[PDB]
From Swiss-Prot:
Consequence of substituting D201N: Great decrease in activity
Entry coiled-coil feature ranges: none
Protein name: Calmodulin-sensitive adenylate cyclase
Record annotation: effect of changing H287 to N/D: Loss of function
Protein family according to the UniProt entry: Belongs to the adenylyl cyclase class-2 family.
Keywords for the protein's UniProt record, in alphabetical order: ATP-binding, Calcium, Calmodulin-binding, cAMP biosynthesis, Host cytoplasm, Lyase, Magnesium, Metal-binding, Nucleotide-binding, Plasmid, Secreted, Signal, Toxin, Virulence
Highest rank taxon of the organism: Bacteria
Gene behind the chain: cya
Region of interest (Catalytic CA1), residue spans: 4-59
Source organism: Bacillus anthracis
Length: 498
């Protein structure tokens, strides 16, 4: 799990959050016994945010800029964002910015970018732009601004800090355009009749509260009456109903993007803590859901370098220590040694995967196959057994997610690993049965063989991680040395041959 992660001040610098904000979060995590995870913030947006600039909310999906004079802000023209020249990307962004203005009837607009005094300085402190030799045009007083832009040229003005821009001599934008000097406009919010510029916001990746702490707050009588009973080990639906009842876990059928009542109070707490530190731009956190910034229940800072590392960190320190977290995205629980993990290629996206899919990924994968081959999982037309067939695929999707999540509501840490392995085995079994009906189309057959192999591989590495001599023992316990050598050798030979 701790695969070369960063921590302390180095983790804080890589995350982009403003130092005083992260520090106030540290207290929340500690007062509430919760893990707080954030996506990394655009590092060129940190100063803007600490200086009070407002953050973008739900209504603006335009990417902020990482380069040029506009760096940190959200350019109306997305060819000035972290998307240097991706045709498809820039076109999607520009559209979103236009719609942001039309759909919010005045609450969102665009205003000319004004690089004040201190900002130009800050840009100069970094490798972004430098001031320079003045320029004259239409009786206007200018100052070009040097930026490694391949395709654009910029410049500022004197009285008004307005910043302008034009295409290079014979260069074309990625949309097939070119033009003369136009002011640079950025996305804005209508505060009290006045449009204020917007910058990057703090993206919550997750909030993982303590399950044991939660249990302690629930009336003892009710808990023992909803938990301690008939469900033998696995299948704790009771735990789930209590978490929903007391506003800890979101409603049954998660609306488009609803937040649990505990999550809403947590947002208020975070935003309130940031205001208390002098922030005057409103809220810094606006919704709750490849490096990840982590603040643990002890106020420590950690930063994971990629998704596999953060998936393993969550399993070991958060989920494995009884904090709450649900995986929607998959990862390999045990990392690759010499023999790389086999891969599957999505027919449509052409993406490659080497993990056991979670439920939603499984549903998507099957969707790619359905598109690409134009047939469903089964072949018998005039559906008969149409009920079990559908149920069958549903059971597999359920077990794939259980492999990653059944241990979320299980208290015993040693039971967590045991239930997870067993879930993987149930998935394998269900998949094999689907293949044993012999009524599966061929493009799906290949994908199911891939699932069988990855499952087999991971379940073998998990068992061994616990008991390194378990392979030997599973076979050894089945042998009998009270018999004579020859008889005992036949038994051995049957077991490994079957
Ligand atoms: Ni956001």
């Amino acid at each position: 799990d701790r695969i070369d992660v960063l921590k302390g001040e180095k983790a804080l610098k890589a995350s982009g959050l403003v130092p005083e904000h992260a520090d106030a979060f540290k207290k929340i995590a500690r007062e509430l016994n919760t893990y707080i995870l954030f996506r990394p913030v655009n590092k060129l947006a940190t100063n803007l945010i600490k200086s009070g600039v407002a953050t973008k909310g739900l209504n603006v999906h335009g990417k902020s800029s990482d380069w040029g004079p506009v760096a940190g802000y959200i350019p109306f023209d997305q060819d000035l964002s972290k998307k240097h020249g991706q045709q498809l990307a820039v076109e999607k962004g520009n559209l979103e910015n236009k719609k942001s203005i039309t759909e919010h009837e005045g609450e969102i607009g665009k205003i000319p970018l004004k690089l004040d005094h201190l900002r130009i300085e800050e840009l100069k402190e970094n490798g972004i732009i430098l001031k320079g030799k003045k320029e004259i045009d239409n009786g206007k007083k200018y100052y070009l601004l040097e930026s490694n832009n391949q395709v654009y040229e910029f410049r500022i003005s004197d009285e008004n800090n307005e910043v302008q821009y034009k295409t290079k001599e014979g260069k074309i934008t990625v949309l097939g355009e070119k033009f003369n000097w136009r002011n640079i406009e950025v996305m804005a919010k209508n505060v009290e009749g006045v449009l204020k510029p917007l910058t990057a916001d703090y993206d919550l990746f997750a909030l993982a509260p303590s399950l044991t702490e939660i249990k302690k707050q629930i009336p003892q009588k009710e808990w023992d009456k909803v938990v301690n009973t008939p469900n033998s080990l696995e299948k704790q639906k009771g735990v789930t109903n209590l978490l929903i009842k007391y506003g800890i876990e979101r409603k049954p059928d998660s609306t488009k993007g609803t937040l649990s009542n505990w999550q809403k109070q947590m947002l208020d707490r975070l935003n309130e803590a940031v205001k208390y530190t002098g922030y005057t731009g409103g809220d810094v956190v606006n919704h709750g859901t490849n490096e990840i910034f982590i603040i643990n229940p002890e106020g420590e800072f950690i930063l994971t370098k990629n998704w596999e590392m953060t998936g393993r960190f969550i399993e070991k320190n958060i989920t494995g220590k009884d904090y709450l977290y649900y995986f929607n995205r998959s990862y390999n629980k045990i990392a690759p040694g010499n023999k790389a993990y086999i891969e599957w290629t999505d027919p449509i996206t052409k993406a490659k995967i080497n993990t056991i899919p979670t439920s939603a990924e499984f549903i998507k994968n099957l969707s790619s196959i359905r598109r690409s081959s134009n047939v469903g999982v089964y072949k018998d037309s005039g559906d008969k057994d149409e009920f079990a067939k559908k149920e069958s695929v549903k059971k597999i999707a359920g077990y794939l997610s259980d492999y990653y999540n059944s241990a979320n509501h299980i208290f015993s840490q040693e039971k967590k690993r045991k239930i997870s392995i067993f879930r993987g085995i149930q998935a394998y079994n269900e998949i094999e049965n689907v293949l044993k009906s012999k009524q599966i189309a061929p493009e799906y057959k290949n994908y199911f063989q891939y699932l069988k192999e990855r499952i087999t591989n991971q379940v073998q590495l998990l068992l061994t991680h616990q008991k390194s001599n378990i392979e030997f023992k599973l076979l050894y316990k089945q042998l009998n040395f009270t018999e004579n050598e020859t008889d005992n050798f036949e038994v051995f030979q049957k077991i490994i041959d079957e």
